From a paper:
We expressed Candida glabrata GDE (CgGDE, 38% sequence identity to human GDE) in Escherichia coli and crystallized it. A multiple wavelength anomalous diffraction (MAD) experiment using a selenomethionine (SeMet)-substituted crystal gave an excellent electron-density map, which allowed us to build the complete structure. Two very similar protomers were found in the ligand-free crystal. Protomer A contains residues 3–1,528, and protomer B contains residues 4–284, 287–330, 336–341, 345–432 and 442–1,528. Residues 629–651 have the largest conformational difference. In protomer A this region adopts a loop structure. In protomer B this region forms a β-hairpin that contains an inter-strand disulfide bond between Cys634 and Cys645, and sticks out of the structure. The orientations of residues 237–458 in these protomers are also different, and are related by a 6° rotation. Our dynamic light-scattering experiments indicated CgGDE is monomeric in solution, like GDE in other species.
GDE possesses the α-1,4 glucanotransferase (GT) and α-1,6 glucosidase (GC) activities, and removes glycogen phosphorylase-digested branches in two steps56. Its GT activity transfers a maltotriosyl group from the branch to a neighbouring non-reducing end, and forms an α-1,4 glycosidic bond between them. The last residue on the branch is subsequently removed by its GC activity. The structures revealed that CgGDE is composed of four domains, and adopts an elongated structure.
Author numbering: 3 to 1528
The structure:
C-alpha cells in the first residue's frame, strides 16, 4: 500500500529539516514487510525527492543515486544511476527512489552552473534499517534485548553452551552477542584472532556445525545472534602472516617506523641484559627510578647515534664536497642570500639542494644534501676555489640547517622517556593498578611495539601491534606516516594483536582485502549481524567496503558499534555512511546519580505532551491530490507508513539521532560490585530497561559476578547456578517491553519524564497514542550514603496500578572456586507498602513510598492517562475535509484571516483577537494567526512558549477558536467547519492539561491545511498546481476579499470587497480604493480564477463614473471622491484584462449598471429618484471615458472645501485634463494637485509645506498615456469583431477624429515625447532641454510638467506603459532603459520611487516626523525614494518581456516551433524574487508589504500586507504560464 516518505530539498539540493530533533541521520523506520511478502515482491520504501520549481539546481539538472533500479540488480557504492529533473518555473518536480532492500544509499545532484560549467552537490545519505524477525514475528529494533557472552567461559562443548543459552532464554533476552568464535591467538584473548577463516577447533570444525547451533538458538529459544568482527588487527602469530608480512606495516611498507623499530629492540635487548646493569629490576621507591632511566640515559639514548635520523651528517657531507667539486661548477642566478642573513641562507639551501623526502623520516641518514647543487651555490656565493673558506662556511650552514632538527629531537626525546617513567610506575608501582612482575621471557620492562618474525620469504620483519593514543584523535592512523606515536612511545599497546595495513583499497594490500572479504561473508551467512570494536579507528573506506560485502550475503545484517569519534557530527557521518543500525551506550560510565539520569534522559525518548508535526503554510497543496477522506485507507496488515491526516501529503523523512543500544554493563567495564556496589545491579538495570531504545547486558551482571573478567587470562567457566540475583527481574522487564513493542512506532509516539532527586531516579514512560504508561521509582546504590526520604509523587489526570517491587540484598561474599566463576549471593525481596491515593475530584493520583525501601530497590507502576483512548487520533484526523466541502473563496477569509479591526466590524467592537498572556495577539483572528505562531513552536517543540503555557493553563484559546465563528456562522460552509472544530475541541478539553497544547496545535493545523487545500481547488489550475510561493501569493486574494458591515463596493448592499491592505485599509471609507482595486484585479482575481467577483468590482465602480472618470476613494459608491486622474485608465485596463482572460468575457460589455449619478457632473444627491434613474452598458461607459477626455473635462471638485481634503488649497480642488492633438496624449493636474498614484499631499506646519503636494504629476504622465494607448488598441480590434459600436470622438470645437487616428498619433508621437536618447547626437528629435537632465537612455516620467526637471526623472512608472502598451517602444531603447531600472531603481523587495542620484532623493518614510524639513516632514517623502512593491511586478513583467525580445541569450527553441525563454532568463527572473519568497515566508501577516524604506529596511508605517504588492507578482506568473506552459 503506502510506504512513501517525502524528502524535500533546498534550492541547493540539500535535504530540509522538518523538525529539530538534534544532530542526526536520515533513518527510515524499521517495519515488517507487508503480510506474507519477501524482499523483492515490492519496494520496501519509496523516497520522494521534491525539488523547488525554478531553483538553480533544476538547470539541466540530474539526480544521482547509487540506489539500484530494481531488486535483481546488486548494490554497488560507486555505480550511480541518472534521473532527470523536470524543470518548471511554476511547479516543483518529484522524483521517486524505490528501495528494494536495506542498506546505505545516497544521492547528489548535478546541474549547470551560472558560469555555464558543471557543478555537483555534497553526497547525502539515508539508511534503510534491516528487518529482524525470529521465526515469523517481527522484532522492532528498539525492543531488542541482548546478552553478551564470552565463549571461552561457556564450557568446552556445544551443549555446555546450549546450557548457557537456556539460562538467558529464561531471562527473555532475544539477542545474543558473541565475542568472536574464531581460533584464538597465543595469549588466547578472543580479540587477537589466530585464523579468521575457521572457528575455534576446541568446539567446532565447520561452518555447518556453527550454523546449526545458531539456527538452533533461533528455532529453540527465539534468539537471534551476532558476532564481534575485528578489522583493526590479527593475532601476533598467524601462519599467513609469515606468508604475507606486507599486510602489516613493516620497514618495507611503512619506512618511517624504522627509527621506532630500532628503539623497540633496544629494549628487548636491554631488559634481560638489565639485571647485570644497574639496580632496579623491581623496586617501589621514587629517588631510585632516576638510577634506572639514567640507565636509559646512557645505555639506550647515548648508544643510538644523536639520531642521524633527523640531522644532516655535517662532516660526511663536506667529505662529499671535496669529491666532485669539479662537475656543475657554479650557479649564476642571484637566488643568493648572503651571509648577513645567516638563517635565510640556511634554508635557502634547504629549498634548492635536497634529495626527495627531506625533513620526513626514513632510513637512518635519509635526510641529505644534493651535493652538486650545493657546490654550485657555494661557488657563486663565496669562491670557486674550495680552500678559500668553504670548510668553515659549508659547515656553518649545515649546523644552522640542523638547529631546528636538533630542537625537533630534544622535544622528541623528552616525550620518549617521560612517557616511559610515568608508565612503568603504574605498570609496577601502583598509582591505581598493581602488579610489579619484574622481568621475564614474556614480560620485559617495555612492551612489544612490534612483532618480530622470520618469514617464509626468508627475510626478517618487524610488524607493530596497534593500541590507542591516550587523548589522540582516532581518525588519525597512528601507524601511518602522519603520526610519530610509535617513536615518542605515545602508544598504549596490545601485544596480542598485530597491525593490519589496508591501504586506499585492494591494490595497497591485496591479500588482506581478499581474506577479510571471505572472513566477513562467512559470518554473514551464519549470523544476523555484526558488532564492531573501536570502529572509530577503522578507516571509513575499509568499513564501508566490507559491511557492503556483508549486506550482499545478509540483506538484513544488523550492526552495532562502540563509536566515540571526536563529536556527535562525526558519529552521525560514520552511521550515515557505514549503515550502522545501533550505537553502544554504557550505563556504567556514569560516575554519579546525576550523570546517570542525564544518560537515561538522552535515550529515554521525547517529553510528555510533545508537539506533533503537520503540513502547515509551508507546503504546497496540489489541487489534484489523493485523500483518505475519513482517514480510513489503512489496513494494519499492509504495514503502511501513515499520512498525518486525510490529505495525502506523505510522511516526511527527517534527520533523527542514530538509534541506541544501551548496555547496563559491557564485557569491558568494571562491575556494580567494583565501581559502585552489587545492590545497584537492580535499579541501574531498571532505568536502562525503561529507555525507549535497545538494551543489552554482559553475562555476569545479572548473576552478580563480583569483578570484571580478565578477557586475556581467566579460564574458569560460567556457573550453572540458575536464577540468581536479577534474572527474575530481567524476565519481567524484557517481557514488559514485548507487550509494549507491539504498538509504539516512531519518535513521536513514545514519551518520557525523568526526575533525579538525590539517590532516587524516577522514570515515567508513556505511549503518546493510547496514554498507557509505566512509572519506575528506582533507588540507587552508588555508595551506602544514609537514609533519604523522597517526596510524594503526583500524577495529574492519571490513575495508577501497582505492578511489582523488589529489593536486592547482599548476603555476604562471593565464593572462591578455581574452575567455576560464581556470583555474589543475594536475596531478592519483594516489597510492599506503596500507597496509591486517587482524588475522584481533581483526578490526581498520589504515590507514597514505604519506609522499608532500601537503596538498591525499585518499584514499578502501570499508569493510564485519562481521556485518551486508542480511537482519539482517528477522530482528530478524520471528518475535516468533508466539513470544508461547502466553503467558498470568500467564506475561507473568515475561517483563516480577519484582522482585529475586521473582526471588530462584525462584533461591534466587542471581540477581536485572542490575547496570549506574556506574548500578544495573533495577527489574524482565524487559523492563519495561530499557524504563524505555531510553525516555529512545533519545529522546536517549545513547550515553554507563552502560547504553550496558556494552552495547558486553560481552555480559553481552545474555546476562542470555536466561538468566533458565531460571528460568521451563516456564511457558506462556516457552520460545518465550526462543528468539526467544536466536536474535536470538545474532546481535547477532556485530556490532561499538559496534553492540550500538542493536540490544539494538531486540530488547528489539520483544519488549516484542509482549508488551504480547499482554496487551491476552487482556484484555477495554474495556481492550484504551483510552488508554495505562488500559492502563498494567491492566498492573499482570500485575505483581501471579504464581506463587511461598515462598507461594501455597493451602496445598496454589503458584499465582497477587496481591501487595499490589512489592518489599516480594511474598514469604512478606508477599505476600497479604485486605483488599488483595478491595479490588483488581474493579479488576485483573474489569475486566480475569481471571475464572477472581478465582474462585481468592475460593475460596482462603473456606477460611480463622473467627469468621465473613475473615483479612487469609493465610499461604497455613496459620495466617492474624484481627484483620481489615474484610476479610470487602470479600470479600463482591468476591463480589457477581464475580457482577454475570462471565457465569454465580451459578455461584460453589455452588462448594465444602474448609473447612480447624473450624466453631467451634476451635484450630489445620493437620496433622489435621479439616482437609480438611468442605465449604462459597460460599452457606453468605456467610450464615455475615451470621448469625454477628448472633448475636454473641466470642473472643480464637488463639495470642495476643507470637509474632504483639509490641507488642499483652494485652487487645488479644480483640476483638469485634455489632449494635445499635435501629440495625441492626455494632460492634467497642476502644482496644487495629486491626480496620480504618487499622491502624497504635504501637511507639516513646522516644515512649512501645508497643501503642497510632494509629487504632483501635472501634464502628460507615462502610465495614463500607456494605458490610453492600450485602451485604443483594445476598442479598435473590438470594433473589428463587432463588439464595440463606436469610432466617434468629439473635440472641444466640434471636430472629429477616428479612434484609429488617435491610436496612430500616440504611435507616431509617444516615444518621441518621452524618450531621452543615449547619444547627444539625436537630442533634436526627442524634444529635450539638455540643461535639465539626469540620465539618458531613459523614458521620461512626465511630458511638460510644471517644474521641468520632474519631467526628466528616472522613476518606476514608465514600466506600466511598457507592460500595457509595448507597441509604443522600439525594442532596443526599451531594453536599455529597463536595464537601467534594474541597476538603479530595483530594491530587494520593492521599486525605488526616485533615482538615488537625484538631490530630492529621500528614501526613508516617517509619517509622524514633526521636524522642519521641507522634503521629509509628515510624510512628503512618500514617493521620492521609498521602495514600493507593486511597482516591482510591472517592472519585472516588462524586464521579462523586453529581455525576451532583445537579448539572444534569453531565447531557446520551441516544441512545434514557438520561441520560449531560455533557462538563462528564468534564472535572472528567479534571482529577483527570492527576497519576496523570503518576505512572505517570514512575515506574521502571510503577505507582502506595501512599501519598504531604503534597501530593504522595514518601514514601520508601511502596511504589512497589501493587495497590489502580491497581485502584481502573480501578474508575472500568469504571463509566463499563459504564454509558455501548454
Amino acid at each position: 500500500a503506502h510506504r512513501t516518505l517525502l524528502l524535500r530539498l533546498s534550492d541547493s539540493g540539500e535535504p530540509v529539516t522538518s523538525c529539530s530533533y538534534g544532530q542526526g541521520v536520515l533513518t527510515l523506520p524499521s517495519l515488517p514487510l507487508p503480510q506474507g511478502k519477501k524482499l523483492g515482491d515490492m519496494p520496501v520504501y519509496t523516497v520522494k525527492l521534491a525539488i523547488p520549481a525554478g531553483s538553480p539546481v533544476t538547470r539541466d539538472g540530474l539526480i544521482w543515486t547509487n540506489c539500484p533500479p530494481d531488486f535483481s540488480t546488486q548494490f554497488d557504492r560507486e555505480k550511480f544511476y541518472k534521473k532527470i529533473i523536470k524543470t518548471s518555473f511554476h511547479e516543483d518536480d518529484h522524483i521517486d527512489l524505490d528501495i528494494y532492500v536495506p542498506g546505505t544509499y545516497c544521492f547528489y545532484l548535478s546541474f549547470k552552473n551560472d558560469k555555464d560549467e558543471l557543478e555537483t552537490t555534497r553526497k547525502f545519505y539515508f539508511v534503510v534499517l534491516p528487518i529482524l524477525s525470529v521465526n515469523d514475528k517481527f522484532i522492532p529494533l528498539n525492543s531488542i534485548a541482548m546478552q553478551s557472552v564470552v565463549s571461552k567461559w561457556m564450557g568446552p562443548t556445544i551443549k555446555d553452551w546450549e546450557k548457557v543459552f537456556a539460562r538467558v532464554a529464561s531471562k527473555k533476552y532475544n539477542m545474543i552477542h558473541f565475542t568472536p568464535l574464531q581460533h584464538r591467538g597465543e595469549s588466547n584473548s578472543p580479540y587477537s584472532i589466530y585464523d579468521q577463516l575457521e572457528f575455534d577447533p576446541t568446539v567446532f570444525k565447520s561452518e555447518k556445525e556453527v550454523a546449526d547451533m545458531v539456527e538452533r538458538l533461533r528455532t529453540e529459544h527465539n534468539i537471534l545472534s551476532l558476532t564481534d568482527i575485528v578489522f583493526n588487527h590479527t593475532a601476533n602469530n598467524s601462519q599467513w602472516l609469515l606468508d604475507h608480512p606486507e599486510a602489516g606495516y613493516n620497514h618495507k611498507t611503512s619506512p618511517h617506523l624504522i627509527s621506532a623499530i630500532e628503539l623497540d629492540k633496544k629494549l628487548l635487548d636491554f631488559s634481560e641484559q638489565m639485571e647485570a646493569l644497574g639496580y632496579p629490576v623491581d623496586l617501589k621507591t621514587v629517588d631510585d627510578l632516576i638510577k634506572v632511566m639514567d640507565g636509559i640515559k646512557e645505555h639506550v639514548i647515548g648508544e643510538l647515534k644523536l639520531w642521524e635520523f633527523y640531522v644532516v651528517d655535517v662532516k660526511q657531507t663536506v667529505s662529499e664536497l671535496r669529491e666532485k667539486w669539479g662537475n656543475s661548477k657554479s650557479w649564476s642566478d642571484d637566488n643568493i642570500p648572503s651571509k648577513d642573513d645567516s638563517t635565510n641562507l640556511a634554508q635557502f639551501v634547504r629549498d634548492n639542494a635536497t634529495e626527495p623526502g627531506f625533513g620526513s623520516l626514513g632510513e637512518r641518514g635519509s635526510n641529505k644534501i644534493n651535493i652538486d647543487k650545493f657546490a654550485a651555490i657555494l661557488k657563486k656565493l663565496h669562491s670557486e676555489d674550495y680552500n678559500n673558506g668553504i670548510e668553515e662556511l659549508a659547515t656553518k650552514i649545515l649546523n644552522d640547517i640542523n638547529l631546528p632538527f636538533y630542537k625537533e629531537y630534544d622535544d622528541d626525546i623528552n616525550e620518549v622517556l617521560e612517557q616511559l617513567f610515568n608508565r612503568i610506575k603504574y605498570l609496577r608501582i601502583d598509582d591505581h593498578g598493581p602488579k610489579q612482575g619484574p622481568i621475564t621471557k614474556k614480560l620485559p620492562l617495555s612492551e612489544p611495539y612490534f612483532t618480530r618474525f622470520k618469514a617464509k620469504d626468508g627475510e626478517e620483519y618487524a610488524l607493530a601491534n596497534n593500541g590507542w593514543i591516550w587523548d589522540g584523535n582516532p581518525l588519525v592512523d597512528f601507524a601511518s606516516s602522519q603520526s610519530k606515536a610509535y617513536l615518542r612511545r605515545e602508544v598504549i599497546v596490545w601485544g596480542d594483536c598485530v597491525k593490519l595495513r589496508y591501504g586506499k583499497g585492494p591494490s595497497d594490500s591485496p591479500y588482506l582485502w581478499e581474506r577479510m572479504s571471505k572472513y566477513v561473508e562467512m559470518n554473514a551467512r551464519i549470523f544476523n549481524g555484526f558488532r564492531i570494536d573501536n570502529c572509530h579507528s577503522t578507516p571509513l573506506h575499509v568499513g564501508q567496503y566490507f559491511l557492503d560485502v556483508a549486506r550482499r550475503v545478509n540483506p538484513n545484517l544488523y550492526v552495532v558499534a562502540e563509536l566515540f569519534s571526536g563529536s556527535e557530527a562525526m558519529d552521525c557521518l560514520f552511521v550515515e555512511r557505514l549503515g550502522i543500525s545501533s550505537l553502544i551506550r554504557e550505563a556504567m560510565q556514569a560516575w554519579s546519580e546525576e550523570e546517570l539520569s542525564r544518560l537515561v534522559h538522552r535515550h529515554g525518548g521525547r517529553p510528555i505532551g510533545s508537539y506533533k508535526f503537520v503540513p502547515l503554510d509551508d507546503f504546497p497543496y496540489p489541487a489534484d491530490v489523493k485523500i483518505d477522506e475519513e482517514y480510513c485507507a489503512y489496513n494494519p496488515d499492509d504495514h503502511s507508513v501513515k499520512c498525518v491526516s486525510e490529505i495525502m501529503i506523505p510522511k516526511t523523512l527527517t534527520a533523527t539521532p542514530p538509534h541506541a543500544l544501551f548496555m547496563d554493563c559491557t564485557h569491558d567495564n568494571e562491575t556494580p560490585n567494583q565501581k559502585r556496589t552489587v545492590e545497584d545491579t537492580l535499579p541501574n538495570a531498571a532505568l536502562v530497561a525503561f529507555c525507549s531504545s535497545a538494551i543489552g547486558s554482559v553475562y555476569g551482571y545479572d548473576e552478580v559476578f563480583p569483578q570484571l573478567l580478565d578477557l586475556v587470562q581467566e579460564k574458569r567457566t560460567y556457573s550453572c547456578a540458575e536464577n540468581t540475583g536479577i534474572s527474575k527481574v530481567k524476565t519481567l522487564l524484557n517481557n514488559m517491553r514485548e507487550e509494549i513493542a507491539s504498538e509504539a512506532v516512531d519518535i513521536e509516539d513514545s514519551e518520557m519524564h525523568v526526575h533525579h532527586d538525590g539517590q532516587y531516579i524516577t522514570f515515567h514512560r508513556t505511549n503518546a497514542k493510547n496514554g498507557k504508561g509505566w512509572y519506575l521509582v528506582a533507588r540507587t546504590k552508588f555508595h551506602s550514603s544514609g537514609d533519604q526520604m523522597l517526596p510524594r509523587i503526583k500524577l495529574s489526570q492519571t490513575k495508577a496500578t501497582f505492578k511489582a517491587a523488589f529489593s536486592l540484598e547482599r548476603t555476604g561474599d562471593a565464593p572462591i572456586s578455581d574452575e567455576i566463576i560464581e556470583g555474589i549471593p543475594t536475596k531478592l525481596r519483594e516489597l510492599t507498602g506503596f500507597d496509591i491515593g486517587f482524588d475522584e475530584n481533581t483526578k490526581e493520583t498520589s504515590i507514597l513510598l514505604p519506609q522499608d525501601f532500601p537503596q538498591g530497590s525499585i518499584v514499578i507502576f502501570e499508569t493510564q492517562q485519562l481521556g485518551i483512548d486508542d480511537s482519539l487520533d482517528h477522530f482528530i484526523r478524520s471528518g475535516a475535509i468533508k466539513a470544508t466541502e461547502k466553503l467558498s473563496l470568500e467564506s475561507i477569509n473568515y475561517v483563516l484571516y480577519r484582522a482585529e479591526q475586521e473582526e471588530y466590524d462584525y462584533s461591534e467592537g466587542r471581540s477581536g483577537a485572542y490575547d496570549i498572556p506574556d506574548y500578544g495577539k495573533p495577527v489574524y483572528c482565524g487559523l492563519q494567526g495561530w499557524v504563524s505562531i505555531l510553525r516555529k513552536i512545533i519545529f522546536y517543540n517549545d513547550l515553554a512558549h507563552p502560547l504553550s503555557n496558556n494552552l495547558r493553563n486553560g481552555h480559553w484559546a481552545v474555546d476562542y477558536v470555536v466561538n468566533r465563528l458565531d460571528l460568521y456562522k451563516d456564511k457558506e460552509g462556516v457552520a460545518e467547519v465550526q462543528e468539526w472544530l467544536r466536536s474535536r475541541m470538545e474532546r481535547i478539553k477532556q485530556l490532561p492539561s499538559y496534553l492540550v497544547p500538542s493536540f490544539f496545535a494538531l486540530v488547528v493545523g489539520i483544519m488549516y491545511g484542509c482549508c488551504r487545500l480547499r482554496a487551491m481547488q476552487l482556484m484555477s489550475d495554474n495556481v492550484g498546481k504551483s510552488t508554495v510561493f505562488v500559492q502563498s501569493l494567491a492566498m492573499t486574494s482570500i485575505q483581501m476579499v471579504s464581506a463587511m458591515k461598515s462598507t461594501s463596493i455597493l451602496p445598496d448592499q454589503n458584499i465582497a470587497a477587496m481591501a487595499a491592505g490589512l489592518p489599516h485599509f480594511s474598514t469604512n471609507y478606508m477599505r476600497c480604493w479604485g486605483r488599488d482595486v483595478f491595479i490588483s484585479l488581474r493579479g488576485l482575481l483573474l489569475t486566480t480564477g475569481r471571475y464572477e467577483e472581478a465582474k462585481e468590482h468592475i460593475l460596482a465602480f462603473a456606477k460611480t463614473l463622473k467627469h468621465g472618470l473613475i473615483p479612487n476613494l469609493l465610499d461604497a459608491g455613496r459620495n466617492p471622491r474624484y481627484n483620481a486622474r489615474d484610476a479610470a485608465w487602470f479600470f479600463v485596463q482591468a476591463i480589457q484584462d477581464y475580457v482577454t482572460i475570462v471565457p465569454g468575457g465580451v459578455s461584460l460589455l453589455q452588462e448594465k449598471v444602474t448609473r447612480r449619478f447624473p450624466l453631467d457632473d451634476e451635484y450630489i444627491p445620493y437620496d433622489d429618484p435621479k439616482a437609480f434613474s438611468y442605465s449604462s452598458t459597460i460599452e457606453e461607459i468605456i467610450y464615455e471615458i475615451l470621448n469625454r477626455h477628448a472633448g475636454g473635462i473641466k470642473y472643480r471638485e464637488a463639495n470642495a472645501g476643507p470637509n474632504l481634503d483639509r490641507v488642499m488649497k483652494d485652487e487645488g480642488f479644480n483640476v483638469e485634463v485634455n489632449v494635445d492633438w499635435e501629440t495625441g496624449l492626455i494632460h492634467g493636474g497642476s502644482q496644487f494637485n495629486c491626480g496620480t498614484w504618487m499622491d502624497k499631499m504635504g501637511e507639516s506646519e513646522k516644515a512649512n509645506s501645508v497643501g503642497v503636494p510632494g509629487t504632483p504629476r501635472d501634464g502628460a504622465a507615462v502610465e495614463i498615456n500607456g494605458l490610453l494607448k492600450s485602451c485604443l488598441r483594445f476598442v479598435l480590434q473590438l470594433s473589428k469583431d463587432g463588439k464595440f459600436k463606436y469610432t466617434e470622438v468629439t473635440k472641444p470645437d466640434g471636430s472629429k477624429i477616428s479612434l484609429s487616428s488617435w491610436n496612430d498619433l500616440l504611435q507616431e508621437n509617444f516615444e518621441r515625447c518621452f524618450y531621452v536618447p543615449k547619444n547627444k547626437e539625436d537630442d533634436n528629435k526627442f524634444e529635450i532641454d539638455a540643461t535639465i537632465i539626469n540620465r539618458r537612455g531613459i523614458y521620461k516620467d512626465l511630458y511638460r510638467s510644471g517644474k521641468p526637471y520632474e519631467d526628466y526623472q528616472f522613476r518606476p512608472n514608465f514600466t506600466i506603459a511598457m507592460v500595457v502598451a509595448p507597441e509604443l517602444f522600439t525594442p532596443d531603447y526599451a531594453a536599455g532603459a529597463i536595464e537601467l531600472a534594474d541597476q538603479v531603481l530595483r530594491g530587494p523587495v520593492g521599486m525605488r520611487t526616485l533615482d538615488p542620484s537625484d538631490y530630492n532623493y529621500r528614501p526613508y518614510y516617517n509619517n509622524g516626523e514633526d521636524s522642519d524639513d521641507f522634503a521629509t516632514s509628515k510624510g512628503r517623502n512618500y514617493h521620492q525614494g521609498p521602495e514600493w512593491v507593486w511597482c516591482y511586478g510591472y517592472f519585472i513583467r516588462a524586464y521579462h518581456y523586453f529581455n525576451f525580445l532583445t537579448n539572444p541569450k534569453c531565447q531557446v527553441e520551441g516544441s512545434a516551433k514557438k520561441l520560449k525563454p531560455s533557462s538563462y532568463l528564468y534564472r535572472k527572473l528567479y534571482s529577483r524574487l527570492l527576497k519576496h519568497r523570503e518576505w512572505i515566508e517570514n512575515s506574521p501577516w502571510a503577505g507582502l508589504a506595501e512599501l519598504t524604506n531604503k534597501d530593504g529596511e522595514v518601514c514601520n508605517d508601511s502596511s504589512p500586507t497589501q493587495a497590489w504588492s502580491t497581485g502584481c507578482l502573480l501578474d508575472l506568473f500568469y504571463d509566463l504560464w499563459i504564454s509558455y506552459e501548454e
